């Protein structure tokens, strides 16, 4: 679920999902169009594609379970949708952590009109 993803993001990066990732660049928190602005935005682009791979799942609300094995995120077995959603969120959280070194506050609340053109998953 969105709330669980937010907690995962905070655990991983030390930033609050809202507002650090909820409105960042062209794809974070409200995906869609344009060339991702930086590596963090690309994390969101891929995460959007990942959710897009699951048209008959409901990643905003469906809850999954996961644990930490010394640092590592381990998605525990739930329904097929839950497992797949968890893997999408895990990847994004890791991606955000891997790209904290470039994260730029100037991309928070990035305006829609600067995001133009479709980029294929």
């Amino acid at each position: 679920s969105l709330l669980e993803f937010g907690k995962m993001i905070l655990e991983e990066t030390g930033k609050l999902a809202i507002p650090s990732y909820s409105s960042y660049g062209c794809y974070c928190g409200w995906g869609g169009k344009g060339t991702p602005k930086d590596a963090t935005d690309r994390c969101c682009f891929v995460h959007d594609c990942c959710y897009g791979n699951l048209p008959d799942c409901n990643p905003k609300s469906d809850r999954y379970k996961y644990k930490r094995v010394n640092g590592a995120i381990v998605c525990e077995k739930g329904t097929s949708c839950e497992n797949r959603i968890c893997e999408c969120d895990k990847a994004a959280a890791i991606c955000f952590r891997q790209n904290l070194n470039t994260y730029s506050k100037k991309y928070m609340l990035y305006p829609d009109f600067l995001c133009k053109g479709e980029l294929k998953c």
Binding site: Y27, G29, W30, G31, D48, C49, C50, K60
Partner: peptide
């Protein structure tokens, strides 16, 4: 919200 939308797309992801």
């Amino acid at each position: 919200v939308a797309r992801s």
